[PDB]
Design a protein around this ligand. Structure first.
Ligand SMILES: O=C(NCCO[C@H]1O[C@H](CO)[C@@H](O)[C@H](O)[C@@H]1O)c1ccc(-c2cccc(-c3ccc(C(=O)NCCO[C@H]4O[C@H](CO)[C@@H](O)[C@H](O)[C@@H]4O)cc3)c2)cc1
Ligand SMILES: O=C(NCCO[C@H]1O[C@H](CO)[C@@H](O)[C@H](O)[C@@H]1O)c1ccc(-c2cccc(-c3ccc(C(=O)NCCO[C@H]4O[C@H](CO)[C@@H](O)[C@H](O)[C@@H]4O)cc3)c2)cc1
Ligand SMILES: [Ca+2]
Ligand SMILES: [Ca+2]
Ligand SMILES: [Ca+2]
Ligand SMILES: [Ca+2]
Ligand SMILES: [Mn+2]
Ligand SMILES: [Mn+2]
Ligand SMILES: [Mn+2]
Ligand SMILES: [Mn+2]
Lengths: 237, 237, 237, 237
């Protein structure tokens, strides 16, 4: 079983597995049942922005999602990620559709991790930034339905030629390089992630959402993780 | 008077103004009487490192002080710096000596500020890094006894040719450029400050310490601020 | 007088002071008479981008100007900026109007300077980024008609409420902080400047242009520098 | 046959294949026979620093190597790398020993690549930094004799337990992630690489050197590329 830490942008209320009634953002530690959620007024057809942040000093994982000219949704959770994740991980974006559907379009993605040592008092750092995605993006591991190059975007879930999202769809993009996320010898470990997204539905009911996630480096899409499981979890436990 | 937010590396217990019995790190919000302290095993004559981090999501000022192959002292305080600081500030380093004395030597200093905005959705940023200080450092405002250029270091307080620190000394260094520290239109404001320092005392009693501080742009050394007030405060209220 | 190094986006051929017959980009070293120019197909009313890059290894000032879906204009000049500029400078943007007029609108501006040193072997750096300008931007020195805050843009030259650019206007914006541009103890000095701009003229004859410039720290708009001198030079020598 | 672009730190004069009489730095475009060389006073047992830089505007590949308190060696060569390398590459460090030997110790390595588009006018960027290396460094592809974790360094060539370098040795470290080094749609492509190194010999004759290199992503150590071929080339052509 993969080890997963995620921020979910959850557009569809699965009230039988702990979702609230409304679209929401959440912090998932090893379960689709968010440890903490906040209400989120997803805006259909509009470009949004997620900022995620962590440091080893506060051990607080925080996410902010916003649209131009709207109040933000933010959620926070105290978690020592040295006790949850392995030392080496991969970072990625995940999305799914079920019975109901939406485009899961990423327009940009950027990430920064830092280790600042006690042993030496010197820093190890990874930073990547995509504002365009190309038809053949060799620093990305695309899983399931995920594709790149259509209008320089990353389409996480399946979309027809006229541009209609398909249901029962799942897809993920991971950064090729493993990331050293925590280290005993570090005085401060920090990571930042930012992405922009276009979730468009023809339905008045979009599903299922987008997640930024951290996994074991060999993470793959769990079997039957379309719909409410967001390509992250094998089950709703 | 000046408006001050500070992290103090305080080497001298002034127990009649709320100091603990031991050298401590402290978060000061408009008062030398730290809202929060932690024990700090300052190591006479060694190069130490200070990391300060704030973000407008967690609203939590944190400091970590460390030497090679020792435990860290860390201290944190929940505070909304929108309700304490004016929108525009200067950042600096202050130090002091009283009856008792120490080198207050700064070997390097870096600082990073970001506003990432709502309604606009476009980031403003400032970052500077000093790994050596020159004899005439025109992007630093030197106050009091603060000098630059000797071993390419910043000496906050007065030192002899023969290496001896003087008492009743006080000095500060401010980054020339004002800093946009918070904005009501920003979804995430954050900042990071790192400095390395060498505190050496010929006595078994070093005084008084070093602080990173954020002030009103026209901040100057208050009268009588030598020793226990660290160049930061006019009195001990 | 002031010491000036500049890249000019020059929209008006002043053929009696060495200008080519066409709108051009130019590298100016202590003279409005560009040491080097290239043809530039300035696009009335579009957002353009300017990239300037220098390094003390190649000793080569290069500029690239581009619009979406057009060819770049690029210009380069071998010059040792240790023999032209004082050790400490300010960086800025200048613009001008004469008989003829244009918006000189700056939408964003970023700058990066590094000294990486010998005998010391430790890097000094400054970086600032403006993706929006506020009504009161305390890290910019505004000279002449330069204003900020309207559409969160920097208007170098005078514009009406009704959107109309005025003639015989001149304006500049300088980064507040002085910049350590070269050091004799550095193995590699380098810098990078990026700005996006919108030049709109109601006539089929726009004038006069925008420049990124590096000056002595106390640089001010020379007398009579409107129109063809671009706020940079007192005369056309 | 791999496609290779390298900066060599060449400690041993192979005068039969175009080496000068003395230790030297060089730019290798698809041949061990440097297109351009400069004299280099390698300092045995001392920590050195290499800075490599390129941009698509100058199409000039430049390298600077220096020690504390010594004059630098620099070399430059005009090369359009869009005409030499594939669009996607891996970056790495390479070193070899032959009949004669040296430690090929890397203490730190950092890299930055940038693409800034015409199609969009938005940037794609990779930056990594190692100041420590760990016993198990999963963002590095180690080939041949290369090992990590001994004193937090990367040993490129084989060294005994007492710390004696072995001859007929070859080794390479590549960044796990493929790098998008050039792109038609880019107005400026730039890359920076920096590393620090300790070359120590017991001999008064060290060999064979260190190289920073760019290759096709599947690059491997050519057969018999110990000695003068630096783990880069199958032959001296
Ligand atoms: O009937 C049951 N459970 C069985 C009976 O269990 C009790 O009695 C037993 C016998 O005595 C005993 O053994 C046991 O312990 C119990 O005492 C049952 C049925 C429904 C629910 C339920 C509760 C609350 C909410 C829901 C719910 C279901 C479905 C949705 C929904 O929106 N469905 C559409 C989703 O379809 C797909 O598409 C979306 C969007 O694309 C995806 O998210 C999704 O993954 C799908 O692909 C909402 C709410 C049901 C409880 C118990
Ligand atoms: O004798 C020849 N060539 C054959 C004769 O060729 C001529 O005549 C033929 C018959 O008529 C005709 O067919 C042909 O066309 C010719 O007209 C020959 C021998 C030597 C050289 C030569 C020239 C200049 C310099 C050198 C040279 C050799 C070796 C070194 C050196 O330093 N050697 C030690 C290196 O050993 C190892 O270790 C180092 C350091 O670790 C590594 O770098 C190296 O890889 C090894 O592992 C220096 C200089 C020889 C030309 C022609
Ligand atoms: Ca859900
Ligand atoms: Ca005290
Ligand atoms: Ca002109
Ligand atoms: Ca050689
Ligand atoms: Mn949910
Ligand atoms: Mn105190
Ligand atoms: Mn001109
Ligand atoms: Mn050579």
């Amino acid at each position: 079983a993969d080890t997963i830490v995620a921020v979910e942008l959850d557009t569809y209320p699965n009230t039988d597995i702990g979702d609230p009634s409304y679209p929401h953002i959440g912090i998932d530690i090893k379960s689709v049942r968010s440890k903490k959620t906040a209400k989120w007024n997803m805006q259909n057809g509009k470009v949004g922005t997620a900022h995620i942040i962590y440091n080893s000093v506060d051990k607080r994982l925080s996410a902010v999602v916003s649209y131009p000219n709207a109040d933000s949704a933010t959620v926070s959770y105290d978690v020592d990620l040295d006790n949850v994740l392995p030392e080496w991980v991969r970072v990625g974006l995940s999305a799914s559709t079920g019975l109901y559907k939406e485009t899961n379009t990423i327009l940009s993605w950027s990430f920064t991790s830092k280790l600042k040592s006690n042993s030496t008092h010197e820093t190890n750092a990874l930073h990547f930034m995509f504002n365009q995605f190309s038809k053949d993006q060799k620093d990305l591991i695309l899983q399931g339905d995920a594709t790149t190059g259509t209008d320089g975007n990353l389409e996480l879930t399946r979309v027809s030629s006229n541009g209609s999202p398909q249901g029962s769809s799942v897809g993920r993009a991971l950064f090729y390089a493993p990331v050293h996320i925590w280290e005993s010898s570090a005085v401060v470990a920090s990571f930042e992630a930012t992405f922009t997204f276009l979730i468009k539905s023809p339905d008045s009911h979009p599903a299922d959402g987008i997640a930024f996630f951290i996994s074991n480096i060999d993470s793959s899409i769990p079997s039957g993780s379309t719909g409410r499981l967001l390509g992250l979890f094998p089950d709703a436990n």
